[PDB]
Design a protein around this ligand. Structure first.
Ligand SMILES: *Cc1cc2c(cc1C)nc1c(=O)[nH]c(=O)nc-1n2C[C@H](O)[C@H](O)[C@H](O)COP(=O)(O)OP(=O)(O)OC[C@H]1O[C@@H](n2cnc3c(N)ncnc32)[C@H](O)[C@@H]1O
Ligand SMILES: *[C@@H]1O[C@H](CO)[C@@H](O)[C@H](O)[C@H]1NC(C)=O
Ligand SMILES: *[C@@H]1O[C@H](CO)[C@@H](O)[C@H](O)[C@H]1NC(C)=O
Ligand SMILES: *[C@@H]1O[C@H](CO)[C@@H](O)[C@H](O)[C@H]1NC(C)=O
Length: 431
């Protein structure tokens, strides 16, 4: 084995929440090691740089312009500003049929849709910061099907706009999870405009990586964990085959807590029971070029044969252009079995259909990146929520020196995850 590394906190996953935690902990005077599966920091925060250093973000697009965000970007010395995407006209296209259409009749634009939606969900103020702190008994409207909620709250004209900001088929989701994609802070942020680093989302992670240096272990994963009342041990494995023992006073886990993800990780009966309940979706973030598409179009997917224009999974959620000519992002969402080969084939088939129908002169594109964002939408049934799933989930925090954060534990937006992570760090700093 390599020389044992002892730190105050071992952090599993150097994505958005793990990197934030690392920087915040260091500033608190706690030492860290970050264990990261990939060969880069940032997880869903991904940038491809062209020859002339144009940043092509193909995961995260931006952050909410709040104190938490500004403090962090400023902390890391990262120049930032309002997101200003390349010029584009919107073409409404039914990607399920390959045929051009228009915005669904009766559907509102974002600002007007958000106003009606925010009024309807204001009653769930406990979700204002994206944390699943739900009173029990659970308000039944919160765990009703979104499709039912929009009828009851007279929001039928707002649905497409909400879908457009939710990476999933909203008509098959309960209301809670739609709120956790396009709720109160989310709507405010979109109305104002996101902020992001000038030199790409990856610039944040490059800066953090420079600070953290050898305390980041890239292409490294936990192999065997021991969790004690006062400390942890994590045996990690690196791509070069070396193993390292990490000793921590505490452990912070940003890995999605699917049971299959927690091999080597001892779990209590309660942890095992709760984590057995997860359901999820797959999410693929592609950057393509040589597509035959117009440089100046964003293609907006409207299902003309479905209620409110919302497509059924699997679907292309986004198909938008870039400042660098020829490059497009394609984001695809499906069920838990919508894996890499299925998603690539689906993408190619949708693009081919546009040609077959005479809509665009597409040809098979070049894939620059095809990134897994699976799992997305870690969720449980309405019945589990009614039985206090999220209360029980949060009660897990702190067992045997172990703490958790990330997209499973709070609304899956970097700004909100940073806020929740700070709450977890506060718990970790209890005296
Ligand atoms: C998928 C996605 C997400 C996204 C987005 C667009 C796409 C396509 N647009 C966003 C946006 O514009 N604004 C925003 O704030 N968020 C947006 N998101 C959501 C995104 O998930 C969050 O911003 C955030 O990235 C989630 O943070 P979290 O820390 O929970 O997750 P992560 O970034 O994926 O990082 C997890 C890290 O853990 C590593 N990992 C996984 N398994 C292991 C193991 N076994 N060992 C070690 N490391 C592991 C991952 O590699 C990753 O780095
Ligand atoms: C972000 O918010 C701050 C505080 O409200 C504001 O001063 C600043 O101009 C905003 N930046 C933008 C619009 O990018
Ligand atoms: C936590 O520590 C206690 C005491 O050492 C032990 O009995 C238990 O198995 C541990 N649980 C986990 C999940 O590590
Ligand atoms: C597409 O992108 C790749 C990778 O950046 C580049 O090498 C290639 O020249 C591009 N193709 C076209 C047609 O511009």
């Amino acid at each position: 084995a390599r020389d044992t590394i002892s730190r105050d906190v071992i952090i599993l996953g150097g994505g958005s929440s793990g990197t934030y935690a690392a920087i915040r902990l260091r500033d608190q005077g706690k030492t860290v090691a970050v264990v990261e599966r990939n060969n880069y920091l940032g997880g869903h925060g991904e940038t491809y740089y062209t020859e002339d250093n144009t940043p092509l973000n193909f995961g995260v697009e931006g952050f909410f312009n709040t104190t938490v965000t500004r403090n962090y970007l400023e902390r890391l010395q990262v120049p930032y500003g309002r997101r200003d995407p390349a010029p584009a006209h919107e073409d409404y296209v039914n990607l399920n049929t390959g045929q051009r259409t228009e915005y669904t009749p009766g559907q509102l634009q974002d600002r007007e849709a958000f106003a009606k939606w925010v009024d309807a969900i204001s009653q769930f103020g406990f979700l204002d910061d994206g944390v699943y702190r739900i009173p029990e008994p659970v308000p039944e409207d919160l765990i009703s099907p979104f499709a039912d909620f929009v009828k009851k709250y007279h929001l039928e004209d707002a649905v497409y706009a909400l879908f457009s900001h939710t990476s999933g088929d909203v008509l098959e989701m309960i209301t809670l999870y739609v709120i956790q994609y396009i709720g109160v802070p989310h709507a405010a942020a979109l109305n104002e405009g996101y902020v992001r680093p000038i030199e790409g989302i990856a610039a944040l992670y490059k800066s953090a990586g420079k600070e953290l240096g050898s305390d980041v272990l890239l292409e490294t994963t936990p192999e065997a964990v021991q969790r004690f009342e006062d400390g942890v041990e994590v045996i990690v494995r690196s791509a070069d085959g070396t193993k390292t023992l990490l000793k921590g006073k505490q452990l912070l886990v940003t890995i999605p807590p699917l049971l299959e993800n927690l091999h080597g990780f001892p779990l209590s009966d309660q942890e095992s029971r709760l984590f057995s309940k997860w359901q999820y979706h797959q999410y693929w973030a592609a950057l393509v070029n040589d597509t035959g598409l117009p440089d100046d179009v964003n293609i907006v997917n409207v299902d003309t044969e479905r209620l409110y224009g919302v497509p059924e999974e699997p679907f292309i959620w986004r198909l938008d252009n870039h400042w660098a000519p020829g490059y497009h992002n394609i984001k695809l969402v499906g069920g838990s079995e919508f894996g890499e080969d299925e998603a690539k084939a689906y993408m190619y088939e949708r693009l081919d259909l546009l040609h077959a129908e005479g809509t665009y002169a597409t040809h098979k594109p070049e894939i620059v990146k095809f990134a897994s964002h699976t799992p997305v939408t870690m969720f449980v049934s309405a019945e589990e929520i009614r039985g206090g799933f999220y209360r029980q989930l949060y009660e897990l925090q702190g067992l045997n020196s172990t703490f958790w954060t990330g997209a499973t534990w709070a609304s899956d937006y970097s700004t909100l995850l940073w806020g929740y992570t700070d709450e977890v760090l506060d718990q970790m700093a209890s005296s």
